[PDB]
Write a protein that holds these residues in place. Structure first.
Motif, PDB file in Angstrom:
ATOM      1  N   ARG A  15      -0.700 -41.804  -9.990  1.00  0.00           N
ATOM      2  CA  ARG A  15      -0.062 -41.221  -8.817  1.00  0.00           C
ATOM      3  C   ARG A  15       1.033 -40.189  -9.168  1.00  0.00           C
ATOM      4  O   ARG A  15       2.051 -40.535  -9.754  1.00  0.00           O
ATOM      5  N   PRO A  16       0.807 -38.914  -8.814  1.00  0.00           N
ATOM      6  CA  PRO A  16       1.852 -37.929  -9.065  1.00  0.00           C
ATOM      7  C   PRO A  16       3.111 -38.239  -8.281  1.00  0.00           C
ATOM      8  O   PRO A  16       3.032 -38.874  -7.212  1.00  0.00           O
ATOM      9  N   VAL A  17       4.240 -37.743  -8.781  1.00  0.00           N
ATOM     10  CA  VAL A  17       5.552 -37.975  -8.161  1.00  0.00           C
ATOM     11  C   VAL A  17       5.632 -37.465  -6.721  1.00  0.00           C
ATOM     12  O   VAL A  17       6.375 -38.008  -5.926  1.00  0.00           O
ATOM     13  N   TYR A  18       4.848 -36.443  -6.395  1.00  0.00           N
ATOM     14  CA  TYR A  18       4.830 -35.847  -5.053  1.00  0.00           C
ATOM     15  C   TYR A  18       3.886 -36.559  -4.077  1.00  0.00           C
ATOM     16  O   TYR A  18       3.785 -36.146  -2.899  1.00  0.00           O
TER      17      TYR A  18
END
Lengths: 390, 384, 390, 387
Positions: free
Chosen positions: B144-147
């Protein structure tokens, strides 16, 4: 058998500037050559529209398009119409001919114009929107500010943002003649350009009589003119009475809310339950929230960017592996209270049911809302209205 | 003054599994207790629907929802209906009672079932969709990307299909196909909403639908790379002259390897009676907008100089930025998207014979494991 | 009668990037295909040059051109040559093969490499320069950052900056074979592009024998590598000894100085007397200062801009009059300690006279110089050398 | 082996007044105690200079410094030398002893003295300059009504330096040099002029045989009219080369004038210069950097121009409407700025045979004088070569 007047398309605004230029525009500037009236130094554009006297039913579509013209920020916006049944409105207030009525401080503090009063009905919102960060002006392929802010997964910036909504239910507020406008909370001289189209599609059916639609604006906390940030919910619920002169069947409430306060931990970025009641019964109870703001990334070339470290799994030349990386996070990616930079707001609807003739109460409660504190501008933009057929 | 039958809502499928389990399901399994018929080992689910005999006009809305039930991939999907006017269809072919008609190899090679033939009309698509990578089953960080604050648990698509009412009228077999090869597969839901006109005089117009082509490889069919060697040309008959005819064209490009037709721009040129009616590049450049629906997508690190806010103000530095397969631009779809058909106003068509042609001239050939192909379906609609 | 070899031109660097990319470039990267050597993560570019064995006199001209490649700032720059007579230099220090010699802390604190020591002679500067703010990268007509920063009196931004100097006196440092380079105090990955040309024009006169020129580097406080900001002048004068192996006649001193500390009230912006002495006699005593930085405005599209109120006299439609206005002031317009963003630095010269063989002393005093204080980076970039004919 | 005479420095003028005081100075005042000769009521200062008979090569450097002594405007200037080969010159015309030769009106209208004629060679310009607006006298606190915030201090004078080595033949042995400023005030200006002759240190370095041939000069030094002639006709003339010459170069000095709005001072006009029927220069004389001279122009006129401007406010970068001062001195002009000198354009002509040759200057869209609109072009030109 009813006569056919045909469809009506109106290009209300077409890249019309919305800006803050107090040396060029005072609180009120009369209609220019294109029919555009400007209020509050350019922050509000307004225009008189005329529509044929439709006898058959119609469908009404609203299409709003915005682009930055230099302003870098994600500012609040309101596409609206001045209520026909109201003596007092934004325009004659701007002209210095009228004022929002004084309010009872025990109920509404100093929040003028948010609820009805003597000769006043709150502005009706056709669409609430939030501008993205610099779309258009900062969107070119080699823009000196945004070109190295473009993430690898975004092949190109969009040059503008566009929103479309069916507003057929609001036809009574637009019928015959009306003043519609756009407000953007811009404080720069560069500002934005806004476009607005109304499409009225007339029914092709001979027998299709137009129904008796009604609209009743109840509340609007948007600070259009000489108004204060609406953090009132942090100290008290906003309660008001309204009259139904005639009993109404299958009434619906439309509620438009966005949370604000763009500093860390402000109401823009924290979940706050909204509870809306009619005649003491809850009709809406929910957290206004969006967790998909990354989906609007291509509309935000000028958004701020941070590097967040993270261990990331990826496919390297020797198969699956992991490594520490510094991943860009955009302000526009962050989850917010019912909007994203570049989104509009779909009103929440609630079927109220039948309403008897007489007095009724309406209440909006955002109990954990925060207070304004110096530069921390916590507030809640809320508008609401009723719609039904008689 | 026409009587009101009222609205009709049908929950056709409700988290109905779509999978590949050849040990549990053969090519044809008759209707189960819930009315679900399964073809090709579970890859196709099908159901008979009935609708009242509406006299007033209606609006038809389709809502399809999909979630992975273990399958990690972004597989092609087709929500469809078996044409009423066709003796041969996917179901009786699966039963072993019929076969796609043989085709003229000079015109269509070995592409059976993509154009009409004796006793056969190609399957009609209600909605083309592409599953995302593992939504639901893998939706609960290294991936999961931070965004992306949270993964979605399912994906949903809605389309107005009023123009297709004639294919659904009275009684019809509708279904969903997913090119899944895993036992865990997916779960699919489908709702049909028929909203009857509230107006007394509003007579239902005489709508018509005429399926022309469909290259989706539903059953015993081959990957459609034919466009790479020849244009697909076919004749069709209009028994009655028709006015203001519209063409609807549904296309997605495929071949998921580097440089394949899934990821390269290819012009599509569609013609009727020798006149071009569509000429465009089927493409999407917004696939990052679907990221939250793709928890199981593959990921690469791409180097880039990035501008960012450091402790001493704005600055730039080299980074290695994650790029997901799901972010990549594709030939008219994204993992997690449906496909809006392109429309073209054909105009009037005389009674008699007409020609239809689909050309994707730079399309690539299948080459070993490089599975380049184009999923194309097309049909006409009009009022008489 | 001496033979003519003809002129020699060398395109040393041609838009060669100067940047800070520690993940791509370590302290030392060997010569690439174009002969460019990179030190300190890209902040220094270096190249070996060769020149024919001139017998006749020559004129040497240096032409350096710089443009931003994204870096917005006005950073310090030094075009230099590694002294031939020095075993230790910037390159072999970068390679990890050598180190600046340790210094006597009572005299030089922790200011390594600023004066000579065992096997070490300070780097010789061919030209000191100061980059302007973002020239080139931010110079286009419709640049989103600099567009509305262009004052009315500036018709167009320049796309680069170029400096030319005669450096004939430095021929001995360049003769036969030498390593020359460019250093820019850049900390961005985008950095700059730099070009450098050497033009050696041979005398057309048959009798014109090349004179026996000599160069002797004395000091250099430029922090090229693993070096510290030179605020030492705030606590003590820098004093050093040097040896003249042979007596010399009519010796000249060349002194290159710029003051720094870009915060309000720092040595970049305050006048500080410099006093330079040889053998106890003052040879230079002056305030290094420029009050013409507005003249470099067209080279500084990305400079910061403030609005300063002022009552201004002007010609209006009804004759001469006055009014309060808000006038743009750019950071690049500000007066500074001997430079402007976009300028080079002409060395000050002083005729020392004759110097006997043996020991001599040299002293540089900037007595009111300020100390480094947290983020206040006050310092003085000073280099000096002697030149004479034997 | 040639003997060394050493360098020569001459302080020709030192804050020598240049003004218009017709009651104190008539058309001609003979040399005063300092050697200064004054013509046209003080508008021209002149001095005889002597230089040693140099055998080695030299470099000649000219340094002119000007300051206002009350005169407020940006006036035209010409540092010059009287041609040695000319019987008629500015000085003996001022004395009343001679006159510019009469001219053919079909060719030169009433533009006396701009081309050669019987016993006349046009004045040779060492340097064309344009005074700034009141430097010195008006070059005086923190807030100022005239001084922009980006200009910390006004300069007290303006200085120009040029290499004029090519003009050594016009200065050799003995010559009359001067300065002209188109000043009409009694206060006027003060002017300084230095000549520096640096002798070559090389024994073998023989001085080359340099030559100079003045062709044209429209500067209105004395009893002359504003040169707007180019607005009706090209200026065409003949010249004689007594001996053939190799690798000849043309030097062309031009400035456009007419300081009213839309005049030739502020509009682009193509100049086309030809020799023997071939174009040798074809260009727009123009300068777009006049803002760089701001600190030399304390008395310039100022306008307010509205514009939206970006700036750093207390809450970050933003934009707002402002009324921005624009100085007359900031404006782009036809090849000069108030406070600038003028670098001559050069062109390599090539070889010229002995005999007759033609020269032509065309500024085809030049404007006419119109009442008080004084459109004109100051043009001078000369040839240089080594024999």
């Amino acid at each position: 058998e009813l006569p056919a007047l045909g469809n009506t398309h109106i290009q209300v605004f077409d890249k019309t500037p919305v800006c803050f230029r107090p040396d060029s525009f005072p609180n009120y500037t009369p209609a220019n050559a294109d029919g555009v009236i400007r209020l509050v130094n350019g922050r509000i554009i307004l225009k008189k529209i005329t529509l044929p006297d439709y006898k058959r039913d119609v469908d009404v579509t609203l299409k709003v398009t915005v682009a930055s013209n230099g302003d870098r920020w994600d500012k609040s916006g309101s596409c609206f119409v001045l209520p026909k049944e109201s003596v007092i409105n934004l325009m004659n207030i701007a002209e210095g001919k009228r004022a929002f009525p004084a309010v009872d401080s025990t109920k509404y503090e100093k929040m003028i114009g948010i609820v009805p009063g003597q000769d006043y009905v709150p502005t009706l919102e056709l669409m609430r929107f939030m501008t993205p960060f610099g779309v258009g002006y900062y969107s070119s392929d080699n823009d000196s500010l945004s070109s190295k802010r473009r993430p690898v997964y975004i092949p190109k910036w969009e040059k503008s943002v566009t929103w479309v909504q069916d507003i057929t239910d609001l036809y009574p507020a637009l019928e015959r003649e009306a003043y519609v406008g756009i407000y953007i909370d811009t404080w720069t001289a560069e500002g934005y350009v806004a476009s607005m189209e109304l499409d009225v599609k007339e029914s092709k059916i001979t027998c299709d009589v137009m129904p008796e639609r009604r609209v009743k604006p109840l509340m609007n906390t948007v600070y259009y003119i000489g108004q204060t940030y609406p953090d009132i919910f942090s100290r008290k619920d906003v309660v008001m009475d309204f009259d139904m002169p005639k009993a109404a069947k299958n009434v619906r409430l439309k509620y438009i809310v966005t949370g604000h306060g763009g500093h860390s931990g402000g109401d823009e970025f924290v979940e706050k339950r909204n509870i809306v009641s009619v005649d003491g019964k809850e009709v809406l109870n929910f957290i206004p929230w969006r967790d998909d703001c990354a989906s609007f990334r291509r509309f935000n070339p000028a958004t701020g960017v941070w590097l967040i470290p993270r261990v990331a799994a990826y496919i390297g030349d020797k198969g699956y592996t992991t490594k520490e990386i510094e991943e860009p996070l955009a302000s526009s990616d962050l989850s917010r209270s019912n909007w994203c930079p570049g989104s509009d707001v779909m009103p929440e609807e609630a079927v109220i049911g039948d309403l008897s003739a007489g007095k009724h109460s309406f209440k909006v409660s955002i109990p954990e809302a925060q207070q304004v504190d110096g530069n921390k501008l916590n507030h809640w933009l809320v508008s609401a209205y009723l719609v039904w057929e008689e």
